Amino acid sequence: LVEEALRKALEDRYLLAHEAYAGGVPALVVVHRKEVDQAKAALSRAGVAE
Amino acid sequence: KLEAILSQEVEAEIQALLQEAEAKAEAVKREAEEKAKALLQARERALEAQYRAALRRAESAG
């Protein structure tokens, strides 16, 4: 869900990476500076937060 | 792609800054020409003065 939301919000110039740990995934989204608000807004609409 | 964004945040600053510093390197140099010219404008009047005074003195003296 998170990937979809970010992808529509942030086009294809965002980087979504994840690495496991035994159970879920801690994920990191890497975005350009000044694209911070938009990036955040996308997480907030899914219900995921920082 | 994502690396093409990165080259555009830089490529923008490095023309803003280098356009600004080629107009200070213009500006100092414009004032430097306008000063040397004026320090010789005052030199031009001075010499004249000294010659107009000088000749009048020699006329009176004689």
UniProtKB/Swiss-Prot annotation, chain B:
List the keywords (alphabetical). ATP synthesis, Hydrogen ion transport, Ion transport, Transport
Function of the molecule: Produces ATP from ADP in the presence of a proton gradient across the membrane.
This protein's record includes keyword Ion transport: yes
- UniProt-listed GO biological process terms: proton motive force-driven plasma membrane ATP synthesis
Q: Which residues of the full protein are shown?
A: 3 to 64 of 188
Its Gene Ontology cellular component terms are:
proton-transporting two-sector ATPase complex, catalytic domain
Record bears the keyword Nucleotide-binding: no
Q: Which GO terms describe its molecular function?
A: ATP binding; proton-transporting ATP synthase activity, rotational mechanism; proton-transporting ATPase activity, rotational mechanism
Annotated protein name in UniProt:
V-type ATP synthase subunit E
The Swiss-Prot or TrEMBL record describes its family as follows: Belongs to the V-ATPase E subunit family.
* This protein's encoding gene: atpE
